[PDB]
C-alpha cells in the first residue's frame, strides 16, 4: 500500500538533503547558522563553515562530537530539557527492538486466533516496553532533575531570583491609594526585608498604540504625533480608575524572596495569593491584570470550548478516514489533515491567551495541555473508531479489521508527518525565500544593515504537541502492528539529528525556562502509556486471554507510579529550592537593576 | 414492620431519660458535670445543679440559651467546628421538609410507573435539596472559616506558633554528629532567625518501660528499680546508633516560623521536607520517627489491607441482610452489626497508627479517611445490593423490590443507631458503673482523693464516622423512600441537643485543633451527595425519564464545585495565615518556654 509514500518520501527527502548539499556554500552563509550571531555579532561559528563531503562530521557528527555539557551553556537549559526528552523517548523505542524482533518472528487469513494467544510474546513484550519506559523516564527524570539543579546553582544573577508576583490585593480602599497602602502593608508585615513595589497597569490600550508606536517612529522614513494623544488621556484615565488587584514586589535576599513565594499570606486565600514571578519574557502581561474569581469561570468556559472543538473537529477525521494514483486522493486528506491540525497550535494559542496563566512558559504547557487532551479523542480514537465505523465475534472481526487498516493509515501518517517534515525543517524553505525577497525589499527601507534575522523561538507550541501525537500513535499501535515501531524508531533516530542541528543552528531561545514543560510532558508520556494499556485492553479484550494478572496489575502500576512520581518529584520541580538560593549567593547584590527589569514600557 | 422498633425504642429511650430524671440529684453530682472541673477543681457549674422539672431549661434550654459565642472559649474550637457541622447538616435536612411534604403527597401495587415520572416532584426536589445543600455547606464553609480565623487571631501564646517539624534530614554523615551539623546548617541558611533544635529519639523501647515506669513508681504502695537498667543501656545504644532523619527547630518570630513551614528547602524534595509542627498532644511520636520513602510503601500496603478488609467484611452484610417475635432475630444481626462495626474505629485506629501521619489530629481525619471509603461499599451498596441479590424490566422490578425493603432495613438501622445510641450517650452507663465499682476499688489504692475522672476525649474516632454512615443513608435513601428523611430529621434534632449537652457536660477536648477535620468532612459530605446523584442515577435509570439535562448537569455541578471549593478554601485552611501571625504579636516573646514544650520524657 504505502510503498509509494516511502518511495516519494525517500525521493524528495533526499532531494531536500540535496538542497542542503547546495546550501552551506553561498553568500547566505550568514543566514543558515544564525545561532552564534547571538554570541557575537559576526560570529557564525568558525569560518571554515563546517563542510566535509556530505559534511557527516561537519553537522551530523559535529552534533555527535558536541554533547549535553555545552547544550546548557550555549543555549538555555530549556533546549537541554527538550533534547534530553527526545533522547529519553529514543531509549523508549531503542529497548523496543527486543519487542519488535520476536513479535516479527511469530508475524481470510491465519490472522490472530485465541489459542496460541501470542500474549506471552505480545503482552509480555508490552510488559517489557512498559517496564523499560518506567526505567527510562524514571532514570532521566532524576537526571533532568539534577540538570535543573545544576543550572540553578550555576546560574548568574537574574532579576527573577528576587521577584515575587502578587495577584489579588484587597479590593477596598481604606483611606489611601494603592501604592502607599501596599507598601505600608509590606512594611508592617516584614522586618525590612522588602525593597519597593511596582504596580500593575491596564496599559493594553496605550500598548495597542505602543507596539504600534514602536512601528510609528519606524514609519518616519516611509503619524509620528497623533498617538501621543492616546498616550495621554486614555492612559491617564486608566491609571486613575482601573489599576487592578495585582502587582510585583522585591526583597533584600533571594531566600526571603522564594520563601515569600511559597507561602499563603492572608486568612482568606481568596485574598493575597502569590506565585513566584517569572521573567518578563516568560510572563504575559496582557493575560495578566485579570481576576482569579473570573479565572475560575474562564477555566469553566474554555473547558467548554474544548468540548465544542472536539466534536466540531470530528468531521475532518471522517473526511479523511473514508479514503483508506488513487493514493494521492489519500494525500489531499492527509496533508489537509496536517494543515487542518497545523492551525491547532494557533487555535490553542488563542485559547492559551484567554485562560489566565500568568507565565507564557506556564501557558505553553497548557497549550499542549489542550493539545494532548484534544488529540487523544480525535486523531487517535476518532481515527481508529473511524476505521471501525467504516468497512463493516463480529465486533471482534471489525476491531481486527480496523487495527491493521487504521495501523497502515497511522503508519503512513507518521511517515508523512516525520520524514517530510524534518526535511522541510532541515533546509528551512521559509528563511531561504524570505532571504531573497526581504533582502530585496528591506534594503529599500534603508534597513539593509539590519536583517529581519531572528529565526524565531524554538517554539514548543509547534514542537512538543507534534511530538505528543506521534507518542500516542507509537504506543497504542505498537502492540497491534509492531512494524510502526520500526518506522517509529526511524522517526526519532532522524529527529535526534536534525533538531539537534537546529538546536545549534538557528533557534535562539525565547525562554530561559529551566524545564517547566518537563514535568507536564512527564505525566503526559505516562498518560500516553495508560492509553496504550487501556486501548491495549481493547485489543486483548477481543482476543480473550487471562486478563486479571494482565490488566489489573498494569492499571495498578500506572496508578502507583502516578502517586509516587507526583508526590516524589512533581512538587520538587514546581518551585525553586531555597538552599540553592542561599548556597548560590555570589555576594554581588544590587537594587537599581531590579527597577528597570520591568517598567511599563 | 418496624413499628415494634419505634415502640420499644421510645419505651426504653424514655426509660433512659427516666434514669436521667433520677440522675442529677445524687452524691455523684460531681461525676455527671465533670467539664467545669477543667476550669477550676471543685467548680461543677453553679451549685444550684441546674434542675427545673424535667429540667427543660436546665439542660435542653440552657443549651439553647448558651450559644456558639461561648462554645469557642469554654472548650476548644474543635468542639465548635463539630457542633457547627451538625448544625449545617441540621439545615441540610431542615430544608428537606419542602421535599418530604410534596413527595409524601404523591405518595402488585400502583407502585411507580414510567409516564407520571414523578421526577419533577422527585428529582426536582433532589435538585432542591442538592441546591440547598450547596448553599448550607458553602455558607457555613465561609462561616467556619471566619470562626477559625477568629480563633487564630484571638489565640493566646502557644509553643506551636514558633514550631516547625522537619522530617527528612541528610542521611550521610559529613564529619560531625547530627546535632551540631544540623545547627550549623540552619545558621548558614538563616540570618539569626533560628533559635535551637531538638533531635528525635527511638525511645519507644525506653518509652515502653517509661509509661510502664510511670506505673511502676505508682506500684510502690501496691519493681521500682529494674526498669532504670533499660533506662540505661538500651536507651544509650539507641541514641548512639539510630536517631532518625527527623527533628524539630524553632525561630525568633511567628512569621519566620510559618513562612519556613510552607516552603520546600533543598533541590531534591526527597530531602529536607518540612511540615508545620502541631501540638505534642496532637502529634504522635511513635508513628513519628519513620521514613517517608517507606511511608510510600506503607500507604501502598495499608491501601491493600483496606481491600482485604472490605471483601472480608462483605460476609456480615449477607449475614444480616437475609434476615429482612421474628424481628428480634433481626435485632441480633443488627446489634451484632453495630458491635461488628463498633470495632471499626479501633480497627482503623490500628491502621491509623501505622499509616505514617505525623499528627493524630491529621491521623483521625485519615481514620474517618478509612471509614467513609470503607462504609460506602459495604454498609450501603453491599446492603442495598444485598437486598437485591436476595428475594429474586425484571432487574427493574428487583431494584424497585430492594430499595423499599432495603429502605425499611436502612430506616430501622438508623432508628436503632440513633434513638438508642443517643439515649445511652445521655446518661453514660459506663461512667455511672465505674463510679460505684472504681470508687469502691480505687479508694483501696489510697487514690480516693483522685478519681479516675477524665471522661475521655470528645473522640471523633467514634463520632464523625458514625455521623458519616447516617449521612450516606440519609442522602441515598432520601429520594426513593423520603420517610427516612423525616426519621433522619429526628436524628439530628435530638442529637443537636444531647451532644451539645455532652459538649458542655463531660468531654474536655484532647485536641486544641482549630478545625482540621472540617475540610476533610467537607469534601466528604460532597462525596456523599455525589453518591446520592450516581446511585440516584441508578434509581431513575430504571425509571426512564429525560436524563441528559438531569444527570449530566448534576455531575458537572458536583465536579465544578469540587474544583472551585478545593482551589478556593481548601489550601486556605490547610495552613495558618502569616498575616494573623504578625497581626497577633502580643509583644510578650520568650525562649525557655519552647524547650520544655516537648522534651523526651
Curated annotation (Swiss-Prot), chains A, B:
Side of membrane Extracellular, spans: 388-402, 480, 542-546
GO molecular function ontology, one term from the record: calcium-activated cation channel activity
A Pfam family matched in the record: RSN1_7TM
Major localization listed first in the record, in broad terms: membrane
UniProt superkingdom: Eukaryota
Family matches, as InterPro entries: Csc1-like, CSC1/OSCA1-like_7TM, CSC1/OSCA1-like_cyt, Csc1/OSCA1-like_N
Ranges per topology, Cytoplasmic: 24-83, 141-294, 355-363, 435-459, 500-517
Record keywords: Calcium, Coiled coil, Ion channel, Ion transport, Membrane, Transmembrane, Transmembrane helix, Transport
Record-given protein name: Hyperosmolality-gated Ca2+ permeable channel 3.1
Outcome of mutating residue 373 to I: In 1.1.ver mutant; promotes activation
Outcome of swapping residue 516 to E: Induces a closed conformation
Family: Belongs to the CSC1 (TC 1.A.17) family.
Topology term for the membrane: Multi-pass membrane protein
TM annotation in the entry: 3-23, 84-106, 118-140, 295-321, 327-354, 364-387, 403-434, 460-479, 481-499, 518-541, 547-567
Function of the protein: Acts as a hyperosmolarity-gated non-selective cation channel that permeates Ca(2+) ions. Mechanosensitive ion channel that converts mechanical stimuli into a flow of ions: activated in response to membrane stretch. Not activated in response to membrane poke.
GO cellular component, one term: nucleus
Subcellular location(s) of the protein: Membrane
UniProt cross-references to PANTHER family, sorted A to Z: CSC1-LIKE PROTEIN ERD4 (PTHR13018:SF100), PROBABLE MEMBRANE PROTEIN DUF221-RELATED (PTHR13018)
Assembly and binders: Homodimer.
Amino acid at each position: 500500500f504505502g510503498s509509494f509514500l516511502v518511495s516519494l518520501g525517500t525521493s524528495f527527502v533526499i532531494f531536500v538533503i540535496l538542497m542542503l548539499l547546495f546550501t552551506w556554500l553561498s553568500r547566505k552563509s550568514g543566514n543558515a547558522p544564525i545561532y552564534y550571531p547571538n554570541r557575537i555579532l559576526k560570529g557564525l561559528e568558525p569560518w571554515e563553515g563546517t563542510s566535509l563531503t556530505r559534511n557527516p562530521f561537519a553537522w551530523m557528527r559535529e552534533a555527535l562530537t558536541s554533547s549535553e555539557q555545552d547544550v546548557v551553556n550555549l543555549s538555555g537549559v530549556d533546549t537541554a530539557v527538550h533534547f534530553v526528552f527526545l533522547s529519553t523517548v529514543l531509549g523508549i523505542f531503542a529497548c523496543s527492538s527486543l519487542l519488535l524482533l520476536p513479535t516479527l518472528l511469530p508475524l481470510s487469513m491465519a490472522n490472530i486466533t485465541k489459542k496460541s494467544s501470542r500474549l506471552w510474546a505480545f503482552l509480555g513484550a508490552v510488559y517489557w516496553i512498559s517496564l523499560v519506559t518506567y526505567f527510562f523516564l524514571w532514570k532521566a527524570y532524576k537526571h533532568v532533575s539534577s540538570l535543573r539543579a545544576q543550572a540553578l546553582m550555576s546560574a548568574d544573577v537574574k532579576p527573577e531570583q528576587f521577584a515575587i508576583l502578587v495577584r489579588d490585593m484587597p479590593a477596598p480602599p481604606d483611606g489611601q491609594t494603592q501604592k502607599e497602602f501596599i507598601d505600608s502593608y509590606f512594611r508592617e508585615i516584614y522586618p525590612e526585608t522588602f525593597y519597593r513595589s511596582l504596580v500593575a497597569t491596564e496599559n493594553s490600550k496605550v500598548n495597542k498604540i505602543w507596539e504600534k508606536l514602536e512601528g510609528y517612529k519606524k514609519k518616519l522614513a516611509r503619524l509620528i504625533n497623533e498617538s501621543v494623544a492616546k498616550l495621554e488621556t486614555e492612559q491617564k484615565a486608566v491609571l486613575a480608575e482601573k489599576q487592578q488587584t495585582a502587582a510585583v514586589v522585591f526583597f533584600t535576599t533571594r531566600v526571603a524572596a522564594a520563601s515569600a513565594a511559597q507561602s499563603l499570606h492572608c486568612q482568606m486565600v481568596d485574598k493575597w495569593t502569590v506565585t513566584e514571578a517569572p521573567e518578563p519574557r516568560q510572563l504575559l502581561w496582557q493575560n495578566l491584570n485579570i481576576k482569579l474569581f473570573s479565572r475560575i469561570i474562564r477555566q469553566y468556559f474554555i473547558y467548554f470550548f474544548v468540548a465544542v472543538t472536539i466534536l466540531f473537529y470530528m468531521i475532518p477525521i471522517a473526511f479523511v478516514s473514508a479514503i483508506t494514483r488513487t493514493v494521492l486522493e489519500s494525500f489531499l486528506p492527509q496533508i489537509a489533515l496536517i494543515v487542518f491540525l497545523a492551525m491547532l497550535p494557533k487555535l490553542l494559542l488563542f485559547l492559551s491567551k484567554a485562560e489566565g496563566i500568568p507565565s507564557q512558559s506556564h501557558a505553553i504547557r497548557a497549550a499542549s495541555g489542550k493539545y494532548f487532551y484534544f488529540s487523544v479523542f480525535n486523531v487517535f480514537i476518532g481515527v481508529t473508531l473511524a476505521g471501525t465505523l467504516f468497512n463493516t465475534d463480529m465486533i471482534i472481526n471489525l476491531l481486527a479489521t480496523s487495527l491493521p487498516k487504521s495501523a497502515t493509515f497511522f503508519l503512513t501518517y507518521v511517515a508523512l508527518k516525520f520524514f517530510i517534515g524534518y526535511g522541510l525543517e532541515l533546509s528551512r524553505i521559509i528563511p531561504l525565500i524570505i532571504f531573497h525577497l526581504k533582502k530585496k525589499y528591506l534594503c529599500k527601507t534603508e534597513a539593509e544593515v539590519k536583517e529581519a534575522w531572528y529565526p524565531g523561538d524554538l517554539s514548543y507550541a509547534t514542537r512538543v504537541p507534534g511530538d505528543m501525537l506521534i507518542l500516542t500513535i507509537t504506543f497504542c499501535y505498537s502492540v497491534i502492528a509492531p512494524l510502526i515501531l520500526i518506522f517509529g524508531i526511524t522517526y526519532f533516530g532522524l529527529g535526534w539529528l536534525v533538531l539537534r542541528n537546529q538546536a545549534l543552528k538557528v533557534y535562539v531561545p525565547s525562554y530561559e525556562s529551566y524545564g517547566r514543560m518537563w514535568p507536564h510532558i512527564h505525566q503526559r508520556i505516562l498518560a500516553a502509556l495508560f492509553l496504550f494499556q487501556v486501548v491495549m485492553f481493547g485489543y486483548l479484550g477481543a482476543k480473550t486471554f487471562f486478563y486479571t494478572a494482565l490488566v489489573i496489575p498494569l492499571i495498578i502500576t500506572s496508578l502507583i507510579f502516578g502517586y509516587v512520581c507526583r508526590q516524589k518529584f512533581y512538587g520538587g520541580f514546581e518551585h525553586t529550592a531555597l538552599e540553592v538560593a542561599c548556597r548560590e549567593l555570589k555576594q554581588s547584590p544590587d537594587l537599581e537593576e531590579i527597577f528597570r527589569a520591568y517598567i511599563p514600557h
